[PDB]
Amino acid sequence: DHRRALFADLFRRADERLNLLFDERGEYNLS
Amino acid sequence: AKRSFHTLFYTLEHDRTAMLEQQQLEESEKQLQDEAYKIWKQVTKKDRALIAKERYQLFANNKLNVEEPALLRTKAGMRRFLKSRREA
Amino acid sequence: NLNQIVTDYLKKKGFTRKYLKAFLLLKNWIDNNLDIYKFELRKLLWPVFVYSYLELVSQGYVDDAKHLLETLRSHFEAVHQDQLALLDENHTTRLYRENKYRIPLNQSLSGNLFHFLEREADNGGATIIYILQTHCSVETSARGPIEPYSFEAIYRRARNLDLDEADAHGVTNRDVLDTSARARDVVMEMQKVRENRDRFVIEGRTGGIGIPVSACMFTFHNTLGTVSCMDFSNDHKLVAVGTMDSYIRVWSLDGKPLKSALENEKNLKVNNRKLIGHSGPVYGVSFSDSSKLLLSCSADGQIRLWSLEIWACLCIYKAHDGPVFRVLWGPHGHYFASAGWDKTVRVFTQDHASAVRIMVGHDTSISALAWHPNGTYVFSASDEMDKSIRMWSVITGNCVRIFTGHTHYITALECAHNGKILASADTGGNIFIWDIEKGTLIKKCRGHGKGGIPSLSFSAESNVLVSGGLDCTVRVWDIELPADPNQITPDQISAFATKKTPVLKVRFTRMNLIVAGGCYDPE
Amino acid sequence: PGANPALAALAGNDNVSFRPSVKHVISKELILYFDKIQAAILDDDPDEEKMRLRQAALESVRSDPGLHQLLPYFVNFITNQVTHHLDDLFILRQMMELAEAVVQNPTLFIDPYASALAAPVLTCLMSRKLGKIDSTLREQYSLRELAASLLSMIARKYGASNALLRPKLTRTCLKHFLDPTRPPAVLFGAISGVAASGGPEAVRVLVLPNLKTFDSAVLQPLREK
């Protein structure tokens, strides 16, 4: 259905955010 | 599919079927004489079946079979791991 | 015939032919559990305290009761203010004494708790077991763990079920299950726990090979051969090196800033520091039983004590004539020993400026030292014309055992954690394993090159040994080979080569993992 | 003459031509112990003595100081049992308990195996089918909650030596969550896993912004039932 595309876009944005969250040692990137 | 190795996990809910299918195919041959998930399965089926078969043979009848190969670490495997780590 | 001499000598000499410990243990155990259980176990915290306090008031230990009440008041300052104020005979105390507390719990959780208490019976488990058996009743139920958002609470609230009698009875599950949102066999349970635990004991070793071990290496760069000694702290958090330039340098092993208690040094950002004040080369450094104190000895003939909280010297000890070569803290860190050029072994306490015990009898300089894990014996080794090992009693100051057999300079001594075995190494590449009670040699281990084995270490169960050598190798040794199922000795398990780095220090952790340190020489 | 050949296999060298079997590396006492433990833990009889024996076996695994050579075998056994018995809640619960007991032993160096332990646990958290009326749902949801707790423990303990473990777990759980097609149990497991692996900031930055849509396209039809 049309929900699949919307949720795929939501996951894409969420993953783009998630990429920058963790640091090398697995800790949060405060900046 | 190969990049997904560095970013995703997967479940073990399709390994038994892969093992059984490979076993049936091999037995017949001997006796003769989403989309990303689908690609992942197509790419990993054979290796997963082999590893499942080894593990299944090791622990038959819930007993440690003493005639099977030991679980030991080698340098070629670590070299493969280092190759993948440099890829990442 | 030495036997005849000894027999003649013997014939001619007339020889004929409290509650806070338990509370803290329980608190730590609860802290180390899975989250899904933490809601239930916490119900045990409030009773164990209250009754305990009352017990002291019953036994006349008023000061201990006051100290216990004050120490643990913080944990309950936000909930039990009224009860704490009342406690600091009333009818409430009589009701507590007459009515035993009810502590609902899950079956598997109860089994885990009982097995843990038995496993630590003598460290505080007995106190909690007795308290629970006397003033508590743990109504066990076969439900799942209860939480404000677990399946049990959600299901009960959705289906509008009633409250179980066992869980009816200062926070309780009722407030989580109320619309406003069996018995026990202790002592018998402990008997069953012990009887079942006795069935899973391993009682031999036939066949197989040694044990795998992991190693982590720390390498020091740009030292130019100025480093004389190295040491690790008890928790593997700090490393100290003494040099030929008279100073000591300390680093944090994970690169984090080092902390100072001085007001001016508040929130300072450095991860290594220098201790200055010796006038000659430093030959020993010893961390005390986090480590607060450091001991050092130098060629100037002095011993120095440093504080690692303010990073300054506290005391100087001056009992030696000539250079001091080795200094060692005791197994628990109030006594210490020293030895060096003048052939005497000295034992001090940090309390006194003069040595409390003097040990005399070696004919040459001392080259190695070691303590016994019980803290009442010391070991020393000499070089040259007298290559022997002596065992000294601290109560009297006399020698009790002599071990002989080395023909090369001795570099290291090490006693096993069980107090029954001794190990020594020399510059020929040999390691000697001695029985202490019989005074005999158990065996020899070979495979190291020539030059010196500066460090040895035993594992937690004393069944494996790790050695570090100046030939740039780390080796692992089996202390007893398995039974027969029917240049290098066969009792070596593993050898790891380093990259142009002589090994100065090796040590075992709690696991099958060791840490080693050294200095890199590119040439 | 007396040196073992299997020693050359323990060093991992490439030129080695000898391939040891289990009997050449593990002593007979350890094999008997492994067999006894596995026999005790996997007993489904409701007798009280059997429950006591199971608890004793779990305590033995959790406290014994001489099980350094059986760790790979424990991990492989857990993986195999989870793989081949997805239609048995009792066995899966026992496997989760065994995995919890293994990582609580203070004498074992567990870092390199961490990820190998995170795969079975995940399979018990977001598997579409678990087991084969209310009691079944009780068991399934209890198992999922236990799996989430174990995953939280694993991620907290071994997240620094395995650099990419936390992002991988969080991404897997998030990918499973933002999927209207999954049944509600898988969504519950996915949200629990996201909370367990990511943390507070993961929920704040990744879950909340997408909730407004989630409750409209997912929760309303389910509510209408």
Short mmCIF file of N, CA and C in Angstrom, two decimals, chain C residues 32-37 107-108 111-112 115-116 119 150-152 155-156 159 188-189 192 196-197 199-212 214 461 485 490 492-494 510-513, chain D residues 2-4 6-7 10 24-30 33 36-37 40 48 51-53 55-57 59-60 62-65 67-69 100 104 106-109 134 137-138 141 145-146 149-150 152-153:
data_model
loop_
_atom_site.label_atom_id
_atom_site.label_comp_id
_atom_site.label_asym_id
_atom_site.label_seq_id
_atom_site.Cartn_x
_atom_site.Cartn_y
_atom_site.Cartn_z
N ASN C 32 23.64 -6.05 40.91
CA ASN C 32 24.26 -6.78 39.81
C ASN C 32 23.29 -7.69 39.06
N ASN C 33 22.00 -7.64 39.37
CA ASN C 33 21.03 -8.54 38.76
C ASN C 33 20.43 -7.94 37.49
N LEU C 34 19.66 -8.75 36.78
CA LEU C 34 18.90 -8.27 35.63
C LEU C 34 17.82 -7.30 36.09
N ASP C 35 17.46 -6.37 35.21
CA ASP C 35 16.50 -5.34 35.58
C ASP C 35 15.14 -5.93 35.92
N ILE C 36 14.71 -6.94 35.17
CA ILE C 36 13.35 -7.47 35.31
C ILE C 36 13.08 -8.00 36.71
N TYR C 37 14.13 -8.30 37.49
CA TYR C 37 13.96 -8.78 38.85
C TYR C 37 14.12 -7.70 39.91
N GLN C 107 9.41 -18.18 42.35
CA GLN C 107 10.08 -19.44 42.68
C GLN C 107 11.53 -19.44 42.21
N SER C 108 11.76 -19.12 40.93
CA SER C 108 13.12 -19.12 40.41
C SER C 108 13.97 -18.06 41.09
N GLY C 111 15.01 -19.46 44.38
CA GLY C 111 16.09 -20.42 44.21
C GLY C 111 17.43 -19.74 43.99
N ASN C 112 17.45 -18.72 43.13
CA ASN C 112 18.68 -17.98 42.89
C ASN C 112 19.18 -17.32 44.18
N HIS C 115 20.63 -20.00 46.57
CA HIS C 115 21.93 -20.50 46.11
C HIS C 115 23.02 -19.45 46.30
N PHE C 116 22.70 -18.18 46.04
CA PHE C 116 23.68 -17.12 46.27
C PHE C 116 24.03 -17.00 47.75
N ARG C 119 26.26 -19.79 48.68
CA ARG C 119 27.58 -19.62 48.08
C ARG C 119 28.44 -18.65 48.87
N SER C 150 5.09 -4.81 33.42
CA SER C 150 5.32 -6.17 32.96
C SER C 150 3.99 -6.80 32.54
N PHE C 151 4.07 -8.04 32.04
CA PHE C 151 2.86 -8.71 31.57
C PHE C 151 1.88 -8.96 32.71
N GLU C 152 2.39 -9.34 33.88
CA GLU C 152 1.51 -9.69 34.99
C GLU C 152 0.60 -8.53 35.37
N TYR C 155 -1.90 -7.54 32.51
CA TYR C 155 -2.98 -8.52 32.37
C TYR C 155 -3.96 -8.40 33.53
N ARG C 156 -3.45 -8.30 34.76
CA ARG C 156 -4.35 -8.22 35.91
C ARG C 156 -5.20 -6.95 35.86
N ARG C 159 -7.86 -7.32 32.89
CA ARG C 159 -8.92 -8.27 33.18
C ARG C 159 -9.65 -7.98 34.49
N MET C 188 15.77 -26.26 55.76
CA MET C 188 15.59 -27.39 54.85
C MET C 188 15.96 -27.00 53.43
N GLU C 189 15.58 -25.79 53.01
CA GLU C 189 15.96 -25.30 51.69
C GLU C 189 17.48 -25.24 51.55
N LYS C 192 18.80 -28.79 51.07
CA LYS C 192 18.59 -29.24 49.69
C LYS C 192 19.56 -28.55 48.74
N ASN C 196 22.20 -30.69 46.49
CA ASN C 196 22.17 -30.66 45.03
C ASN C 196 23.46 -30.05 44.47
N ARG C 197 24.01 -29.04 45.14
CA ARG C 197 25.25 -28.44 44.67
C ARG C 197 26.41 -29.43 44.72
N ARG C 199 26.55 -32.31 43.68
CA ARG C 199 26.48 -33.28 42.59
C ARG C 199 27.22 -32.85 41.33
N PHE C 200 27.80 -31.66 41.29
CA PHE C 200 28.40 -31.10 40.08
C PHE C 200 29.83 -30.66 40.34
N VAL C 201 30.63 -31.56 40.93
CA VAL C 201 32.02 -31.29 41.26
C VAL C 201 32.92 -32.05 40.30
N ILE C 202 33.95 -31.38 39.79
CA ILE C 202 34.93 -31.98 38.89
C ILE C 202 36.11 -32.46 39.73
N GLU C 203 36.49 -33.72 39.56
CA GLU C 203 37.37 -34.42 40.49
C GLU C 203 38.48 -35.17 39.76
N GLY C 204 39.16 -34.50 38.84
CA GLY C 204 40.33 -35.10 38.22
C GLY C 204 40.67 -34.41 36.91
N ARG C 205 41.73 -34.93 36.28
CA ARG C 205 42.15 -34.44 34.97
C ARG C 205 42.90 -35.57 34.27
N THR C 206 42.22 -36.24 33.34
CA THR C 206 42.81 -37.30 32.53
C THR C 206 42.67 -36.92 31.06
N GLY C 207 43.80 -36.80 30.37
CA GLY C 207 43.79 -36.44 28.97
C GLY C 207 43.63 -34.95 28.75
N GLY C 208 43.68 -34.56 27.48
CA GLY C 208 43.55 -33.17 27.11
C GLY C 208 44.87 -32.44 27.11
N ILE C 209 44.78 -31.13 26.91
CA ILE C 209 45.96 -30.26 26.86
C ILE C 209 45.76 -29.09 27.81
N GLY C 210 46.71 -28.16 27.81
CA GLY C 210 46.67 -27.01 28.70
C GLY C 210 45.52 -26.06 28.41
N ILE C 211 45.63 -24.83 28.91
CA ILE C 211 44.52 -23.88 28.90
C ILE C 211 44.85 -22.73 27.96
N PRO C 212 43.92 -22.28 27.11
CA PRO C 212 44.19 -21.09 26.30
C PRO C 212 44.22 -19.82 27.14
N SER C 214 44.86 -15.34 26.84
CA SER C 214 44.99 -14.12 26.07
C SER C 214 45.97 -13.18 26.75
N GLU C 461 43.95 -20.04 40.64
CA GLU C 461 43.97 -21.35 41.27
C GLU C 461 45.37 -21.95 41.35
N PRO C 485 46.00 -41.22 29.70
CA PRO C 485 44.76 -41.98 29.49
C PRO C 485 44.98 -43.43 29.08
N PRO C 490 58.24 -30.55 28.08
CA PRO C 490 56.88 -30.78 27.58
C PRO C 490 55.78 -30.10 28.39
N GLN C 492 55.44 -26.85 28.83
CA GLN C 492 55.11 -25.55 28.28
C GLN C 492 53.82 -25.63 27.47
N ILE C 493 52.92 -24.68 27.69
CA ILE C 493 51.66 -24.61 26.97
C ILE C 493 51.74 -23.68 25.78
N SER C 494 52.38 -22.52 25.94
CA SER C 494 52.37 -21.50 24.91
C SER C 494 53.60 -20.62 25.03
N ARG C 510 41.83 -11.71 36.90
CA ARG C 510 40.91 -12.71 37.45
C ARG C 510 40.54 -13.79 36.44
N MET C 511 40.72 -13.52 35.15
CA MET C 511 40.36 -14.44 34.08
C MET C 511 41.63 -15.00 33.44
N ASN C 512 41.45 -15.87 32.45
CA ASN C 512 42.57 -16.41 31.68
C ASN C 512 43.05 -15.34 30.70
N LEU C 513 43.59 -14.28 31.28
CA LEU C 513 44.05 -13.11 30.54
C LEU C 513 45.18 -12.48 31.34
N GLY D 2 58.10 -36.63 24.29
CA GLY D 2 56.89 -36.55 25.09
C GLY D 2 55.98 -35.39 24.79
N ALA D 3 56.38 -34.48 23.90
CA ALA D 3 55.54 -33.34 23.57
C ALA D 3 54.30 -33.79 22.81
N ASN D 4 53.16 -33.20 23.15
CA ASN D 4 51.92 -33.54 22.47
C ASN D 4 51.91 -32.96 21.06
N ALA D 6 49.03 -32.22 19.43
CA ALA D 6 47.93 -31.28 19.44
C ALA D 6 48.37 -29.89 19.89
N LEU D 7 49.49 -29.80 20.61
CA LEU D 7 50.00 -28.49 21.00
C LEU D 7 50.26 -27.62 19.77
N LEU D 10 47.24 -25.93 18.82
CA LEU D 10 46.79 -24.87 19.71
C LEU D 10 47.43 -23.53 19.38
N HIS D 24 41.00 -35.34 22.02
CA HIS D 24 42.41 -34.99 22.14
C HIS D 24 42.64 -33.69 22.90
N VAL D 25 41.61 -32.87 23.07
CA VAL D 25 41.77 -31.55 23.66
C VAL D 25 41.09 -31.42 25.02
N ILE D 26 39.96 -32.09 25.23
CA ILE D 26 39.16 -31.95 26.44
C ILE D 26 39.31 -33.22 27.27
N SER D 27 39.48 -33.05 28.58
CA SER D 27 39.63 -34.19 29.48
C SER D 27 38.28 -34.88 29.69
N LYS D 28 38.35 -36.13 30.16
CA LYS D 28 37.14 -36.93 30.31
C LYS D 28 36.22 -36.37 31.38
N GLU D 29 36.80 -35.82 32.45
CA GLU D 29 35.98 -35.25 33.51
C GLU D 29 35.15 -34.08 33.00
N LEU D 30 35.74 -33.23 32.16
CA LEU D 30 35.01 -32.09 31.62
C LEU D 30 33.90 -32.54 30.66
N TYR D 33 31.12 -33.76 32.82
CA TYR D 33 30.46 -32.62 33.43
C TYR D 33 29.53 -31.92 32.44
N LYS D 36 26.44 -34.07 32.00
CA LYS D 36 25.57 -34.01 33.16
C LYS D 36 24.80 -32.70 33.21
N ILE D 37 25.48 -31.59 32.95
CA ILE D 37 24.81 -30.29 32.99
C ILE D 37 23.70 -30.24 31.95
N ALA D 40 20.73 -32.30 32.97
CA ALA D 40 19.95 -31.75 34.07
C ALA D 40 19.11 -30.56 33.62
N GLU D 48 9.56 -31.67 41.95
CA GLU D 48 10.31 -30.64 42.67
C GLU D 48 11.80 -30.92 42.65
N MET D 51 13.40 -29.63 39.60
CA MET D 51 13.60 -28.18 39.63
C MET D 51 14.82 -27.82 40.47
N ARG D 52 14.99 -28.49 41.61
CA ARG D 52 16.17 -28.24 42.43
C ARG D 52 17.44 -28.60 41.68
N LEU D 53 17.43 -29.72 40.96
CA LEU D 53 18.60 -30.12 40.19
C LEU D 53 18.91 -29.11 39.09
N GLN D 55 18.20 -25.88 39.13
CA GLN D 55 18.76 -24.69 39.76
C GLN D 55 20.21 -24.93 40.18
N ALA D 56 20.50 -26.13 40.70
CA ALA D 56 21.87 -26.45 41.08
C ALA D 56 22.80 -26.44 39.88
N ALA D 57 22.34 -26.98 38.75
CA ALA D 57 23.16 -26.97 37.53
C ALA D 57 23.43 -25.54 37.07
N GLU D 59 23.49 -22.84 38.95
CA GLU D 59 24.44 -22.25 39.88
C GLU D 59 25.86 -22.75 39.62
N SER D 60 26.00 -24.04 39.33
CA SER D 60 27.31 -24.60 39.03
C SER D 60 27.92 -23.93 37.81
N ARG D 62 27.24 -21.00 36.81
CA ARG D 62 27.45 -19.59 37.13
C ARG D 62 28.65 -19.34 38.03
N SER D 63 29.12 -20.35 38.78
CA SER D 63 30.15 -20.12 39.79
C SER D 63 31.44 -20.91 39.60
N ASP D 64 31.44 -21.98 38.81
CA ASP D 64 32.60 -22.87 38.76
C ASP D 64 33.82 -22.14 38.22
N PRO D 65 34.98 -22.23 38.87
CA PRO D 65 36.18 -21.52 38.39
C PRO D 65 37.06 -22.28 37.41
N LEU D 67 36.03 -23.68 34.05
CA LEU D 67 35.31 -23.94 32.81
C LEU D 67 35.83 -23.09 31.66
N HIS D 68 37.15 -22.92 31.57
CA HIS D 68 37.71 -22.07 30.52
C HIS D 68 37.70 -22.75 29.16
N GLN D 69 37.77 -24.08 29.11
CA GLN D 69 37.86 -24.80 27.85
C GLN D 69 36.50 -25.16 27.26
N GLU D 100 22.25 -16.27 30.34
CA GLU D 100 22.41 -15.32 31.44
C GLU D 100 23.44 -15.82 32.45
N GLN D 104 27.64 -14.21 33.53
CA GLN D 104 27.78 -13.72 34.90
C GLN D 104 28.93 -14.38 35.65
N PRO D 106 32.57 -14.64 36.77
CA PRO D 106 33.63 -13.63 36.78
C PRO D 106 35.01 -14.13 36.37
N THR D 107 35.16 -15.42 36.06
CA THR D 107 36.45 -15.98 35.67
C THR D 107 36.61 -16.13 34.17
N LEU D 108 35.62 -15.72 33.38
CA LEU D 108 35.61 -15.96 31.94
C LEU D 108 35.81 -14.66 31.18
N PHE D 109 36.65 -14.71 30.15
CA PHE D 109 36.87 -13.58 29.25
C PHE D 109 35.92 -13.73 28.07
N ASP D 134 -4.63 -18.38 27.31
CA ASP D 134 -3.92 -17.26 27.91
C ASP D 134 -2.51 -17.65 28.31
N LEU D 137 0.18 -16.97 25.78
CA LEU D 137 0.53 -15.56 25.67
C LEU D 137 1.37 -15.11 26.86
N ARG D 138 1.03 -15.58 28.06
CA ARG D 138 1.86 -15.28 29.23
C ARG D 138 3.29 -15.71 28.98
N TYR D 141 5.13 -13.52 26.19
CA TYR D 141 5.50 -12.17 26.59
C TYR D 141 6.56 -12.19 27.68
N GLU D 145 10.23 -10.39 27.34
CA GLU D 145 10.76 -9.47 28.34
C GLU D 145 12.12 -9.92 28.85
N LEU D 146 12.27 -11.22 29.10
CA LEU D 146 13.56 -11.74 29.56
C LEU D 146 14.63 -11.52 28.50
N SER D 149 15.77 -7.93 28.58
CA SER D 149 16.65 -7.66 29.72
C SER D 149 18.06 -8.19 29.46
N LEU D 150 18.16 -9.41 28.93
CA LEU D 150 19.47 -9.99 28.64
C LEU D 150 20.20 -9.17 27.58
N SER D 152 19.87 -5.94 27.03
CA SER D 152 20.36 -4.74 27.70
C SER D 152 21.66 -5.03 28.45
N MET D 153 21.70 -6.14 29.18
CA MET D 153 22.91 -6.49 29.92
C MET D 153 24.10 -6.68 28.97
#
